[PDB]
Amino acid sequence: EWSSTAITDRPTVNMLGGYYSQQQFLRNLDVPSVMDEAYKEFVMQLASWDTRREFWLQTDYYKQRMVGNSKADAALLDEMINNIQFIPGDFTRAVNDSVKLIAETAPDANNLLRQYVAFASQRAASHLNDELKGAWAARTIQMKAQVKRQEEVAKAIYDRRMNSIEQQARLENLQAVGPAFDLDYDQNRAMLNTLNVGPTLDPRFQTYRYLRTPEEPVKRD
Amino acid sequence: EWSSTAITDRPTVNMLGGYYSQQQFLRNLDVPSVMDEAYKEFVMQLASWDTRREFWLQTDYYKQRMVGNSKADAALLDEMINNIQFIPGDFTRAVNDSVKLIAETAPDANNLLRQYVAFASQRAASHLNDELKGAWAARTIQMKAQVKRQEEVAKAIYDRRMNSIEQQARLENLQAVGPAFDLDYDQNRAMLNTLNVGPTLDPRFQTYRYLRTPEEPVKRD
Amino acid sequence: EWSSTAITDRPTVNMLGGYYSQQQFLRNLDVPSVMDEAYKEFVMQLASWDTRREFWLQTDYYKQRMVGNSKADAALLDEMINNIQFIPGDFTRAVNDSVKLIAETAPDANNLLRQYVAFASQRAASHLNDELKGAWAARTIQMKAQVKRQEEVAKAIYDRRMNSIEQQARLENLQAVGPAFDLDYDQNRAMLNTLNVGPTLDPRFQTYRYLRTPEEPVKRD
Amino acid sequence: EWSSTAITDRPTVNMLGGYYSQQQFLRNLDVPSVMDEAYKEFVMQLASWDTRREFWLQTDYYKQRMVGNSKADAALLDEMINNIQFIPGDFTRAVNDSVKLIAETAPDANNLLRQYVAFASQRAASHLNDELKGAWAARTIQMKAQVKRQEEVAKAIYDRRMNSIEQQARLENLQAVGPAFDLDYDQNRAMLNTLNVGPTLDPRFQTYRYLRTPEEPVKRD
Amino acid sequence: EWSSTAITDRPTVNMLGGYYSQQQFLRNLDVPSVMDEAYKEFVMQLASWDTRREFWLQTDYYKQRMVGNSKADAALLDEMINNIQFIPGDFTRAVNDSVKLIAETAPDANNLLRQYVAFASQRAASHLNDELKGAWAARTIQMKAQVKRQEEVAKAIYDRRMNSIEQQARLENLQAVGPAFDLDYDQNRAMLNTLNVGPTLDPRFQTYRYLRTPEEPVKRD
Amino acid sequence: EWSSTAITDRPTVNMLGGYYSQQQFLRNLDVPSVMDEAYKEFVMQLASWDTRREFWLQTDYYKQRMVGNSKADAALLDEMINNIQFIPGDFTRAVNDSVKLIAETAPDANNLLRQYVAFASQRAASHLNDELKGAWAARTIQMKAQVKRQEEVAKAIYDRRMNSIEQQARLENLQAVGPAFDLDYDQNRAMLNTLNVGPTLDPRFQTYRYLRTPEEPVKRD
Amino acid sequence: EWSSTAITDRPTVNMLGGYYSQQQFLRNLDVPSVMDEAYKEFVMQLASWDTRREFWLQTDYYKQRMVGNSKADAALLDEMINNIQFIPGDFTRAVNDSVKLIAETAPDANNLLRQYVAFASQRAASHLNDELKGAWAARTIQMKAQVKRQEEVAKAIYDRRMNSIEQQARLENLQAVGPAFDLDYDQNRAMLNTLNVGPTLDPRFQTYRYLRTPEEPVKRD
Amino acid sequence: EWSSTAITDRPTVNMLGGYYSQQQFLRNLDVPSVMDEAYKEFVMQLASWDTRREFWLQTDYYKQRMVGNSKADAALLDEMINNIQFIPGDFTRAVNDSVKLIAETAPDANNLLRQYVAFASQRAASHLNDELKGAWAARTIQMKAQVKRQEEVAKAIYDRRMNSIEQQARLENLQAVGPAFDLDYDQNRAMLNTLNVGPTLDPRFQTYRYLRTPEEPVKRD
């Protein structure tokens, strides 16, 4: 009987907090902006049937409307999932992305859509953070192997040279100094050191901004 | 009963002031125009429901029409949000963006449209500065860590040369000069300086230009 | 009752005087023809509601038809702005940009359209000049700072070397020669000099050529 | 009579576990996302007639409805293969891929679809690992041949130099040192070590993600 | 009443005479065929209202039909402008550009169209030279500045090495040679010579070619 | 009467065995995956009239339906060929390649489609091995000529050097060693070595995988 | 009454004779096959109204049909021009270029079409030869100027070096040796020579081949 | 009456014999596969009227049907040219090219279709051989001129080094030895030999493959 509508877009750099420069850090090591990628997760969370189901189940609004009939309670749940409607923008006609939520009173429509948007955002950020951890750890592992191969090339160059000099200053000298490492090696080594520190995983960042924040509707549907 | 019309297009370099040259500065480090991206935020602010809500709330126009009934004051707020109509252009057709505003008199429709355009532009600039602020800060920490790693590499190379000389002037010469630094270190350091100064926040800047300025309507709607 | 028509296209190189080589100068420092860009602004001026309004207000033709009533006078002005009709070309079809002006006599239709085309073109020129002035200024600021960072880089290196020669002739050599400047720095210094002269802003230049010049129509509309 | 629904999309990077780093490691040697290619396999598995057939064969649900007549049991299996329906998504219109499974009860339709999705996904992972195992193997054979050839090139140069210099320190050294090897050879050598260790096959991995997870339907079909 | 037809297409290399080598020369400095650009100007001239108007004014066919009454003559001139009809081609359907000219006799229709075509081509060839002359001058100025700057760099390095020596034969020595100029300065220098001489403006050249030459119609329209 | 159906897709890397790493080896020498290419030939074989005809002639099913009349037996053969129908997949609609086979009993439809799919696969495998054997022959001939050209160049340079020296250590020196061969020569020598071994031509490999395996139809057509 | 058809295609390399290697030589100096380019001129000639006109005027067949009435003779000429019909290929659906010719008897239709095709081909060759001759001149001139700038650079370097030395052997060296020319200069000098010889212009080459040669029709149109 | 059908596609590398390696040899100098280009020509030969006409004239089938009258035998030939129908494929729908041949008996339709396809293939191969010859020949001329020039460059250098030497050991060195020659020269020379040897001509090769071999029709059209 009453609805709120939100219209959203990509979050700003500031909103992404610690997430932004670590995802850029990783990118400028691997080779659609971070804020787009982040938004894409949000938009997926917002439209997801699962996201809508999990939201309602953790709501007082829903819980208070149960009657203890397994089957009427499942249908109520299904109705409520169908009362959150996401419409993908098409940007050919300046139509932005929007979500609408239907409920039985006006303050409920406003409060619940704001809460849903936050819920969708928190799930998105948790997820983008999962992906960051398993991109950081993977790049750490990859970098460890490269540095390890570099040690093993160096040592094999050292051993060849070691052999060749035996067959008296240069033997002892080379034997006390070890394998000869280039700048490439020393650079990768320092990069490992920051990588080994591990990412900062802050769960609080926002994953969208509002072009239209929900408000108490003034008339019924 | 009376409506004003405006027609906008993207700003120019001068319209953008200190923001332009700060934005290009940061693009020349991470390696569509700056004014296209300015205008895109402007158009977004212009169409925005939030922008319209907040414009009216700050208006003597809306305030003098308040009766102190909260429900009715909210309904009037909504009716006036719907009195500002944004119309996207289409470049296949060569139609520019245009915004309309309805009010109770001709002079009001004109002045209110001029204020609302200026209000939207100012919101766009603030947002653009916010982005800049936050991207500059990201880049600054990025550069800060790159120089640090640069210092650790030099220190590793130095220790190695320090052990290799132990195993007598060259020792004392090295023991006193510290680690050697490449041109790239000094250039980054000088780049860190200017970054540390931080950007010039100009809140002055226009984010659109008029092709058609609001004037007084000649007849009612 | 009577109308003229103009058909336009982009200005020739000669028609831009000094504006051309200067815009070229600035183009070939950062890495659609200059004449295309110029014509772009002209076309935008020619179609603008503001340009038509300002044109008529400045015309004796309009002034002689005023009756001293504010409303009647604003209606007449609005009617006149609508009497200048720009039709964008379809260059798939060899249809070019064209402009029609309706008036009450044949000589008026012709003289006015001529004056209108020149009025629009003058506004385009002034604006292309504000852009130029603001593009040169930005470039000069970026150049100064680059050179300044270059001097700070040479200074850090000098001090480092200085401090390294200490721990005797070559100390005095270094002490009297100052920092070492690369060719790149010297090129930047001379480029800077020409930039500090600052652009010549000739307001004259023309911003379109005629494919069809207005003439006195031989019959009524 | 009862039906469950699921909607899927491509898995994420950490959903792929060990598979992703290994496949990325291979692509880096021989110089469309890994998740895209994983999802493509998943989708092929989910739609596959063979996969449906083999899923019902291993199901207690099917097995408890067999009567031990080979014709009647083959007819039932057929009815049940046709009771899993894959419905291809459509990029043009933001429709995602989806699958429906029909069964004799509501709990069955839920459990079974969950089991089918997991079953199709384990088959996709088995397949991807198989591809990895085989591609990695060819890579390894290739690499061996390359190293072999580099050693035949170095031996040829050795003999030529050996023979040349005869016609005595340099002779005897040459005799002691063996062929000379460049950096690329030790680099390949070190790489060959890691290919020999063989890829670690993560058999646990997920090849899709849920947008909509099966639930017990509320009413009959 | 009596009409004639021409069909044209782009001119060939030899067709452009001495204009072609000149345009290629300038193009090989800053870094659609020259013949494409030329045809485009021809087609533009052929179709232009101004071109048709000026053609008829300069015609004996028109002058002999003037009655010495300004209005009656301008009406006749207008009817003649409309008696020349450009029909743009479409290169989707292998249709070439054609042009029709209607006149009071078959001989006239033939001669006039031939004259009109030659007139349009000559106006195009003047416009092309003009562009050349101006693009060329702009390039010389640019080139003058470039060399000028090269000398300021050369002098700065001179004065710095002069100062470095002061603080002996090598002094006086450097004092006699002057600044050291690289290969590139002398190259620019010799190019500047060929730029100063100025382009050759062949006024001779053709800007189109006939696929169908005008002939006397056999009958009336 | 009864029909079976198969749906197929590109073979895995594994099913290509020794063929894959050999097609790859040839691919890196000259400068769509190998498995796509393999599948392409399979699909060609599956749909070919010749392949269907050759298949049935080689079948007891056909031989047992012969009556010893040339006309009746040719007509029967033609009816069989028309009983194997191939439908190219439309990948945009997630519909894959499928082949259907009609026959007189359900077990016959199943077993013959299996044999037929295997028949076509084996024709594809032998064909791909003929392309291999001959691509290799082509590469091997070219390599030999390149090497021979290299020998004849070093010979020319040798003789040039030989005359010049005569006209005395280095004379007998040059005489005793021979023409000077660079590393690129030696790399080509080894590459030729491995080319002379010649490819392995395993006819055994598989050239499709099933997404739908033929099964006994449960009902007539 | 009767008609022949020919179908053509681009000429072979061989049919182009001496023209081919010369156009290739000018191609490899200016940094769409030659035979394609030649055929493009052929097809232009073949379709051309002027070509059909000039052909008929030069034919006994037309000359013999003249009656000495201008009007009747011109109408007959026009009628015969329209009896040569060219239809452009559509290469998407394997329809090649063709030309049809109508005449009053079957032998005439064959003979005249073979003549017309030969006539069109000869005009094509003559034109391509003019194109060539003018390209080879444009090129000779450019090389002449290039070599002359080179001469003047070397002289400037010589003069500068000559002076510096004055403030005794190597002076008299410089005196007698002259300016120092690079390999580039000498290569360009030798190219200049082959250019001065001038192209060969055999006007005999064929500019099409036939896929369908005209023949005597076996029935009336 | 009766007809046969053949379906064809592009040949495979082995089917091109000695032609492939030769065409690729020329191709790797000059800076669609060879089998595509081979196939392009077969298809043209197959569909060609000339090819169909000449095929029939050389057939016992046609000869035995001639009656010794020119008009009657020409009408027969024509009927038979129209009895070979080529049908291009459309690969959007996976349709291959196919050719049908009609005749008075079944055995004739089969044998004639087989002979016609081979006839067309033979013509294609001859044409491709001719192209290869011409292209080879031209390229030899080219290289002959390129070596000629290379010698003239070295000769000019020799003369200059000679003259500078004049104003005595090295004078006799240079006076005895000869002009100096770069690697490029000897490599070109070695290439010139293999070019002089000339191309090997397979008059043998196959220029298509069968997807459907003509067979005896079982029934009429």
Short mmCIF file of N, CA, C and O in Angstrom, two decimals, chain D residues 126-185:
data_model
loop_
_atom_site.label_atom_id
_atom_site.label_comp_id
_atom_site.label_asym_id
_atom_site.label_seq_id
_atom_site.Cartn_x
_atom_site.Cartn_y
_atom_site.Cartn_z
N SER D 126 36.20 -30.72 -11.98
CA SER D 126 36.98 -31.86 -12.47
C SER D 126 37.51 -31.61 -13.86
O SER D 126 38.68 -31.80 -14.12
N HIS D 127 36.65 -31.10 -14.73
CA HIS D 127 37.01 -30.81 -16.10
C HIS D 127 38.08 -29.73 -16.25
O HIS D 127 38.99 -29.88 -17.05
N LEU D 128 37.94 -28.65 -15.50
CA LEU D 128 38.88 -27.55 -15.57
C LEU D 128 40.27 -27.98 -15.10
O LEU D 128 41.28 -27.66 -15.74
N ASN D 129 40.30 -28.73 -14.00
CA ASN D 129 41.54 -29.29 -13.50
C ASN D 129 42.19 -30.21 -14.52
O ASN D 129 43.39 -30.14 -14.75
N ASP D 130 41.39 -31.05 -15.16
CA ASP D 130 41.85 -31.90 -16.25
C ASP D 130 42.51 -31.09 -17.35
O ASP D 130 43.55 -31.45 -17.82
N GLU D 131 41.90 -29.99 -17.75
CA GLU D 131 42.46 -29.14 -18.79
C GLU D 131 43.81 -28.59 -18.29
O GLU D 131 44.81 -28.58 -19.03
N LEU D 132 43.81 -28.18 -17.02
CA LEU D 132 44.99 -27.59 -16.42
C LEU D 132 46.12 -28.61 -16.44
O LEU D 132 47.20 -28.32 -16.94
N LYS D 133 45.83 -29.79 -15.92
CA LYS D 133 46.78 -30.87 -15.84
C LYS D 133 47.43 -31.14 -17.22
O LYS D 133 48.65 -31.35 -17.31
N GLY D 134 46.63 -31.10 -18.27
CA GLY D 134 47.09 -31.47 -19.62
C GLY D 134 47.85 -30.34 -20.29
O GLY D 134 48.90 -30.57 -20.90
N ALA D 135 47.33 -29.12 -20.17
CA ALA D 135 48.04 -27.92 -20.63
C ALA D 135 49.38 -27.71 -19.92
O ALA D 135 50.39 -27.40 -20.56
N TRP D 136 49.40 -27.91 -18.61
CA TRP D 136 50.61 -27.81 -17.81
C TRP D 136 51.66 -28.84 -18.27
O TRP D 136 52.86 -28.53 -18.35
N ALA D 137 51.19 -30.05 -18.58
CA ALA D 137 52.03 -31.13 -19.08
C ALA D 137 52.68 -30.85 -20.44
O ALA D 137 53.82 -31.22 -20.66
N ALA D 138 51.93 -30.23 -21.34
CA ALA D 138 52.45 -29.93 -22.67
C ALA D 138 53.45 -28.81 -22.49
O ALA D 138 54.54 -28.85 -23.06
N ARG D 139 53.08 -27.83 -21.68
CA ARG D 139 54.00 -26.77 -21.32
C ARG D 139 55.34 -27.33 -20.83
O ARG D 139 56.41 -26.80 -21.16
N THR D 140 55.28 -28.41 -20.05
CA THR D 140 56.47 -28.98 -19.41
C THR D 140 57.34 -29.70 -20.46
O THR D 140 58.55 -29.47 -20.54
N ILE D 141 56.71 -30.54 -21.27
CA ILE D 141 57.40 -31.15 -22.42
C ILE D 141 58.10 -30.08 -23.30
O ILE D 141 59.32 -30.17 -23.57
N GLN D 142 57.33 -29.06 -23.71
CA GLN D 142 57.85 -27.91 -24.46
C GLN D 142 59.09 -27.35 -23.77
O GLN D 142 60.15 -27.24 -24.39
N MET D 143 58.95 -27.02 -22.50
CA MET D 143 60.04 -26.42 -21.76
C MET D 143 61.28 -27.29 -21.75
O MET D 143 62.38 -26.80 -21.94
N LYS D 144 61.10 -28.59 -21.55
CA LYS D 144 62.23 -29.54 -21.58
C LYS D 144 62.98 -29.47 -22.92
O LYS D 144 64.20 -29.28 -22.95
N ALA D 145 62.24 -29.58 -24.02
CA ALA D 145 62.81 -29.48 -25.36
C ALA D 145 63.62 -28.19 -25.57
O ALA D 145 64.70 -28.22 -26.13
N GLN D 146 63.08 -27.07 -25.09
CA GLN D 146 63.73 -25.76 -25.19
C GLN D 146 65.09 -25.71 -24.45
O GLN D 146 66.04 -25.07 -24.89
N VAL D 147 65.15 -26.41 -23.33
CA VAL D 147 66.32 -26.41 -22.47
C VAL D 147 67.36 -27.33 -23.08
O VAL D 147 68.54 -26.98 -23.20
N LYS D 148 66.90 -28.52 -23.47
CA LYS D 148 67.63 -29.46 -24.29
C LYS D 148 68.29 -28.73 -25.49
O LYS D 148 69.52 -28.79 -25.64
N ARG D 149 67.50 -28.02 -26.29
CA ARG D 149 68.03 -27.28 -27.43
C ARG D 149 69.03 -26.21 -27.05
O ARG D 149 70.01 -26.02 -27.75
N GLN D 150 68.81 -25.51 -25.95
CA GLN D 150 69.76 -24.50 -25.53
C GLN D 150 71.11 -25.14 -25.21
O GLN D 150 72.16 -24.54 -25.47
N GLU D 151 71.06 -26.35 -24.65
CA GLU D 151 72.26 -27.13 -24.31
C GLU D 151 72.95 -27.71 -25.54
O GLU D 151 74.16 -27.95 -25.54
N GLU D 152 72.19 -27.95 -26.60
CA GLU D 152 72.82 -28.36 -27.84
C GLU D 152 73.47 -27.20 -28.58
O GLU D 152 74.51 -27.36 -29.19
N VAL D 153 72.88 -26.02 -28.46
CA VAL D 153 73.50 -24.80 -28.97
C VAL D 153 74.82 -24.43 -28.25
O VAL D 153 75.79 -24.00 -28.88
N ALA D 154 74.86 -24.60 -26.93
CA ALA D 154 76.03 -24.23 -26.15
C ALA D 154 77.18 -25.21 -26.38
O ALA D 154 78.35 -24.82 -26.30
N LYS D 155 76.83 -26.47 -26.67
CA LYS D 155 77.82 -27.52 -26.93
C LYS D 155 78.45 -27.31 -28.30
O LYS D 155 79.67 -27.45 -28.46
N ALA D 156 77.62 -26.98 -29.28
CA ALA D 156 78.12 -26.63 -30.61
C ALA D 156 79.13 -25.48 -30.57
O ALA D 156 80.14 -25.52 -31.29
N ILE D 157 78.86 -24.47 -29.74
CA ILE D 157 79.73 -23.28 -29.66
C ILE D 157 81.03 -23.67 -28.97
O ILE D 157 82.10 -23.18 -29.32
N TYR D 158 80.92 -24.58 -28.02
CA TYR D 158 82.02 -25.09 -27.24
C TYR D 158 83.03 -25.78 -28.14
O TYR D 158 84.20 -25.41 -28.13
N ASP D 159 82.55 -26.75 -28.92
CA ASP D 159 83.38 -27.50 -29.86
C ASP D 159 84.10 -26.58 -30.86
O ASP D 159 85.33 -26.69 -31.03
N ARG D 160 83.34 -25.68 -31.48
CA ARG D 160 83.88 -24.68 -32.42
C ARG D 160 85.03 -23.87 -31.79
O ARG D 160 86.07 -23.69 -32.41
N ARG D 161 84.82 -23.40 -30.56
CA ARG D 161 85.83 -22.67 -29.81
C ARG D 161 86.97 -23.60 -29.39
O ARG D 161 88.14 -23.24 -29.48
N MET D 162 86.60 -24.80 -28.93
CA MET D 162 87.56 -25.84 -28.57
C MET D 162 88.51 -26.13 -29.72
O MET D 162 89.72 -26.08 -29.55
N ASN D 163 87.94 -26.43 -30.88
CA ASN D 163 88.73 -26.73 -32.05
C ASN D 163 89.56 -25.54 -32.49
O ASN D 163 90.76 -25.68 -32.75
N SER D 164 88.93 -24.37 -32.53
CA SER D 164 89.58 -23.15 -33.01
C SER D 164 90.89 -22.86 -32.30
O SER D 164 91.90 -22.60 -32.94
N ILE D 165 90.87 -22.93 -30.97
CA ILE D 165 91.96 -22.41 -30.17
C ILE D 165 93.22 -23.31 -30.16
O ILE D 165 94.34 -22.83 -29.92
N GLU D 166 93.05 -24.60 -30.48
CA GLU D 166 94.19 -25.52 -30.65
C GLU D 166 95.23 -25.06 -31.68
O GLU D 166 96.45 -25.16 -31.44
N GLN D 167 94.75 -24.56 -32.81
CA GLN D 167 95.55 -24.53 -34.04
C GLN D 167 96.18 -23.18 -34.40
O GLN D 167 95.65 -22.11 -34.06
N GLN D 168 99.21 -22.58 -22.63
CA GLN D 168 98.13 -23.52 -22.93
C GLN D 168 96.95 -23.40 -21.94
O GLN D 168 95.99 -24.20 -21.97
N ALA D 169 97.03 -22.39 -21.08
CA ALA D 169 96.00 -22.12 -20.08
C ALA D 169 94.60 -22.10 -20.68
O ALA D 169 93.72 -22.84 -20.23
N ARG D 170 94.40 -21.27 -21.70
CA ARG D 170 93.07 -21.15 -22.28
C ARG D 170 92.51 -22.48 -22.77
O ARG D 170 91.32 -22.75 -22.59
N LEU D 171 93.36 -23.33 -23.36
CA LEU D 171 92.94 -24.68 -23.76
C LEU D 171 92.42 -25.51 -22.58
O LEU D 171 91.31 -26.05 -22.63
N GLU D 172 93.24 -25.61 -21.54
CA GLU D 172 92.89 -26.41 -20.37
C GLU D 172 91.67 -25.86 -19.61
O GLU D 172 90.84 -26.65 -19.15
N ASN D 173 91.52 -24.53 -19.52
CA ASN D 173 90.33 -23.93 -18.87
C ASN D 173 89.06 -24.32 -19.59
O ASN D 173 88.09 -24.79 -19.01
N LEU D 174 89.07 -24.06 -20.89
CA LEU D 174 88.00 -24.41 -21.79
C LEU D 174 87.60 -25.87 -21.56
O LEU D 174 86.41 -26.20 -21.52
N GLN D 175 88.62 -26.72 -21.37
CA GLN D 175 88.43 -28.13 -21.06
C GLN D 175 87.73 -28.32 -19.71
O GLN D 175 86.85 -29.19 -19.56
N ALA D 176 88.09 -27.48 -18.74
CA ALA D 176 87.52 -27.55 -17.39
C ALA D 176 86.12 -26.95 -17.23
O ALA D 176 85.32 -27.47 -16.47
N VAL D 177 85.83 -25.86 -17.94
CA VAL D 177 84.63 -25.02 -17.68
C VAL D 177 83.31 -25.54 -18.25
O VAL D 177 82.24 -25.29 -17.68
N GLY D 178 83.39 -26.25 -19.37
CA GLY D 178 82.18 -26.65 -20.09
C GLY D 178 81.60 -25.51 -20.91
O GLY D 178 82.16 -24.40 -20.98
N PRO D 179 80.45 -25.75 -21.55
CA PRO D 179 79.82 -24.70 -22.36
C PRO D 179 79.38 -23.49 -21.51
O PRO D 179 79.14 -23.64 -20.31
N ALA D 180 79.28 -22.32 -22.14
CA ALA D 180 78.85 -21.10 -21.45
C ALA D 180 77.36 -20.88 -21.64
O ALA D 180 76.81 -21.08 -22.73
N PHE D 181 76.70 -20.45 -20.57
CA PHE D 181 75.25 -20.41 -20.53
C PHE D 181 74.79 -19.04 -20.17
O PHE D 181 75.28 -18.45 -19.22
N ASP D 182 73.84 -18.51 -20.93
CA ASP D 182 73.31 -17.18 -20.63
C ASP D 182 72.17 -17.23 -19.63
O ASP D 182 71.62 -18.29 -19.35
N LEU D 183 71.84 -16.06 -19.10
CA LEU D 183 70.77 -15.86 -18.14
C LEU D 183 69.45 -16.54 -18.51
O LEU D 183 68.77 -17.08 -17.63
N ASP D 184 69.08 -16.52 -19.79
CA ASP D 184 67.79 -17.12 -20.22
C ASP D 184 67.73 -18.61 -19.95
O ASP D 184 66.69 -19.15 -19.69
N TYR D 185 68.88 -19.27 -20.01
CA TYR D 185 68.97 -20.70 -19.77
C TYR D 185 68.74 -21.06 -18.30
O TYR D 185 68.07 -22.05 -17.99
#
